[PDB]
Symmetry: D3
Subunit: 221 residues, 6 copies
Amino acid sequence: YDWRADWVKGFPIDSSCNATQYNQLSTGLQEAQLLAEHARDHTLRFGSKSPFFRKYFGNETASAEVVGHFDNVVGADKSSILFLCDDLDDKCKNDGWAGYWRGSNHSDQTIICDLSFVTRRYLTQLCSSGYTVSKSKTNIFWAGDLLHRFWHLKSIGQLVIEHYADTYEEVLELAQENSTYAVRNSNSLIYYALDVYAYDVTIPGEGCNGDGTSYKKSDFS
Amino acid sequence: YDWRADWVKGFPIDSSCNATQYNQLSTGLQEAQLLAEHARDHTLRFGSKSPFFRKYFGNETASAEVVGHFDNVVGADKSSILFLCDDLDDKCKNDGWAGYWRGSNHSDQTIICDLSFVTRRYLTQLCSSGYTVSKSKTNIFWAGDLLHRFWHLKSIGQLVIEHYADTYEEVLELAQENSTYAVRNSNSLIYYALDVYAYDVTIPGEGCNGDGTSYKKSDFS
Amino acid sequence: YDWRADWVKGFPIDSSCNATQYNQLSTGLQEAQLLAEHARDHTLRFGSKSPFFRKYFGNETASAEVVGHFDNVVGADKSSILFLCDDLDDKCKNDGWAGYWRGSNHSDQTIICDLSFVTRRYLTQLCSSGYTVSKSKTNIFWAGDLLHRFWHLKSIGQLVIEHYADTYEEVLELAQENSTYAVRNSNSLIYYALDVYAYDVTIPGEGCNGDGTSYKKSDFS
Amino acid sequence: YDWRADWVKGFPIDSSCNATQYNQLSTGLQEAQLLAEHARDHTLRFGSKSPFFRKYFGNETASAEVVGHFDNVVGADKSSILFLCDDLDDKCKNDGWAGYWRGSNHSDQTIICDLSFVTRRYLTQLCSSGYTVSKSKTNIFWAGDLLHRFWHLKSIGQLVIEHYADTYEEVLELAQENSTYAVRNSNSLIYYALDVYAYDVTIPGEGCNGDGTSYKKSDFS
Amino acid sequence: YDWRADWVKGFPIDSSCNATQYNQLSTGLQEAQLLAEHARDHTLRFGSKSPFFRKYFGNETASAEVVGHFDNVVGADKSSILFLCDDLDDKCKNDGWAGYWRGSNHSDQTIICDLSFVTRRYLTQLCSSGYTVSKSKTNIFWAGDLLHRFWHLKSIGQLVIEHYADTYEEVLELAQENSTYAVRNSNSLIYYALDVYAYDVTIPGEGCNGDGTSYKKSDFS
Amino acid sequence: YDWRADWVKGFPIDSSCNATQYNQLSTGLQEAQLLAEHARDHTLRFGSKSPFFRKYFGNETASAEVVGHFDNVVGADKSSILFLCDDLDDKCKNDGWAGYWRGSNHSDQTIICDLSFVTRRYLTQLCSSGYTVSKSKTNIFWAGDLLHRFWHLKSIGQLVIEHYADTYEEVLELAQENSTYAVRNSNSLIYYALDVYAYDVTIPGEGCNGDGTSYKKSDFS
């Protein structure tokens, strides 16, 4: 039983979406996977010696679950997940809703409404038009929004990631008070992934955190 | 700061070892890393749909920490770690000792005595001469012994992997009674790695467990 | 004189642009080059046997200058061209402008204004939100807008590409009446490139021309 | 319709040529394409900056039709072209005839007589035995002889390349007098290709023109 | 007739051996082939300019048969050769027998008994535990044991390689007395291969000959 | 001592030859080496099962020296060999002399006269214009003549290849009478190498021996 020839590592898309919607959903999913892979590599290279790990997860925490989450996002068997473009539950009629989760009856199914195709931006436009990681909402780009949607599925989240703190300040206090629960928090992982990507690639050596802190090479050891 | 050029992903060896000791220690270390890589790939492919995972870690456990442990073993920064072939602390004099951990003063160093160079075996002789995973000792091969030595180091173990169960029966009971401490038990990880390697590579489809269980393709779904 | 070692086939950018402007200008330039490359490949493969070539350049025209223009764009030498983000001529105050050519004194420099970073789009959103090649303006996307700035330059334009017909109807009339000037007209080449890219990649077999004409495999022979 | 899968870029040979005829003619046919590829690369790299372009096509002529002419030979569909070794029109009897074009009835077919397999030379022997580019006939080698046959075919010539000047002096006068017809003149292109190959590959930095001119690196700018 | 497709360059193994025996026999065979390849490369690089060649084959001998033998071992047609794990002649009952050749009736077949799977070593342990090329037996390792079996087969030995001198002293005397017969001698070839591998790879610059001699770079000229 | 980075496997040419003699001598040497490589591959694949081996070397001869000679020609250290275009011994004044060996004073030097650049053919014209391996001279092509010159050097011939039979009939009789001496005969090796190449590459399945024998696939077993 060669299981290396049956391994699917990309997110499937249903046939409800036409060519135009498929073209942009594929790019968004690929960008989300690229962000997750970079976060995994940064964690593996540094650990708790980097100042970004120490401020989102704890001063002396172990980096095993953190790398495992992004490893599951990057490489795993996505043979049951399906993304649909059809409103099968009558919920896109709400205000400001760009998608939703089908629930417990269909735990590996997600629906995308038409607001996503007009409001979401791409990774080449990061830290532009006044965007900052700590003062803007995390769902402005395709990568952050789709990462947030990934934690709901049964094959990725596995019913352990939840919402314990949502605002930036609450995330910062969770990092220092309850270090066990701030590795399974939805917002901490997305903040970390968005913060370490703008420091290595977008603006090397500076980033766009926008909260009044600057990190040098001497802080990484 | 281009940190992708300073990344060292192999285990450094000291100069106390002459040519014929280096020749064998390097091969042993490479085999241990290969075993870790295969275990991580199997876990990512299957998760809790595998009978081996289900029997060593729990019926409905989440696979995020096992993947992280094996990924830390495979790829991370091995710059502070050193393997020595010199008896600085004078402990190789004991009977049946093939090495030891230098302690809390030097938490990233370990000593290899001369017994390792006359007793340890290679991965091509697995499941031969009457060897079985569940009835023989785990340190007979280079890969298992070196995996056991890896968990002691501060840059890999991170002071979370301990000895909660040592025998096969205790390992099987702890997987069903206390599934939170099983993902950080030393022997459970090595048993899982050896079992899945013997099932996938050495004797494809049968394995060499030796306790009256046979698994088919229908048990993986 | 090994001239293959100092051959530059990419458009250089000045140091007056910061990181965020560089990140988007580079992507726009690469997209324009990719569009030109696809147009050249389609022309070489088919010639006057394709209906797009026939409708934009003439029924029995020869395809040599058309191939040469796109080949000059893709792979000429670009060591004296510069793109600047600095307003050195006080021309940004005019309403609606997104950039301009520096003139005949400096016949190889172009200035990109801050309006280009708010409105231009990317190739993955082609034929969406009601965009049609026939009825919309050519400078909505990065590639179509940047390709028209290349014909102004001395190295690429060579003072032979001019404005002989601007609207869609005039472009369609020039192709049939004056076939000699059609291959040197600025808008005809951009229309041809956009049409063939939309037909071959974005929506395979349909395109998004939006003027009531549909082409099948039998028109290509 | 995937038109990149059935793209033919070599010249087909009929079954009337036996083993040795095929062996020699295929090599002769590929050498001409190599010559055309080098000429195209030189034109793209320099343009009117090189002193070889200026003396054959004009002091300030634009280089797009030349690039297109050579790129048509290098890469284009050749599925309708056939080379035959059979004398069907009863013409391989005139003195000094090495082949002929089948005419307007079959405008994509060529016949090769038996003098070609006795009197044609290869590119490794260029500029030897007293051969000079300007003082010798242009059909002494396989590449130069096949290039002028390529211009007669409907698919590569397209009824635009003719004979407006045949000797070296007339070729040199046409460049300065009538620059519009120099770029579609049969002999100027072959002279240019031979010159730039001999200058760059055969005798690097000198060439074998043999007319009393020497060009240095200072002339190329 | 394409004879390059049905070309077998590895040694086939029969179905009498189960998985455990197959796993070790294949590794031994590939190690023997690697040793032969290194010996051929050393001979090609140096010839009679190396001190090992002059002492195993003669001071002024020609290296043609020597390189031919190892080239035959490395790459040839091993299509009629078979290795079996069954005892079809009842000869493994003798003491100290690790295998035998099936004889003249079956000239391309050989039997492997069970001692081979308990007493043979690997190339990573060369020159260790007191092993010495000059003083130990040549059949301790898999490679040196299988090389001696290769000379018995009809298609690798071809009825010319025999036993003329067995001990080290006899080999050293035959080298200088009869240089014609010491190029088709089993032990001479095996000793030469083991020595040039141990000098070049295992302990670079020193080797493990263990007979009171040592060579430097000044002896290779 | 890394001797793999100091390995020269091509034939050096002096600076006496100008730009146009180097171009042809280099190609001739490459073609000779390619012919030797093909002969080695044919010998390795078949041995004494092919009818070409059996008629030139013997009905049941062993193929070790034959493969070693061609292996020495293909890959060895050509660091003391030199080819010169300057007449130092005043011997080209003879008639029909295309080169000569410098003698025992300089055992690794060869001189090429000017007939070689006027009367030598290439491998793409084999079996053409009435050439047959059996009835024509062996020094008509670059490959055969240079192969003949290689056996004189002390680093390749090694003072064992001589002239024992020169005509085709004597060569045919030597194989049946004295098989020991027809493996170090100069003309037998050249006749074998030309014949197997003509049969395999030039005219697949037939060849151009021109003697009255035709070999089928059933003769190779």
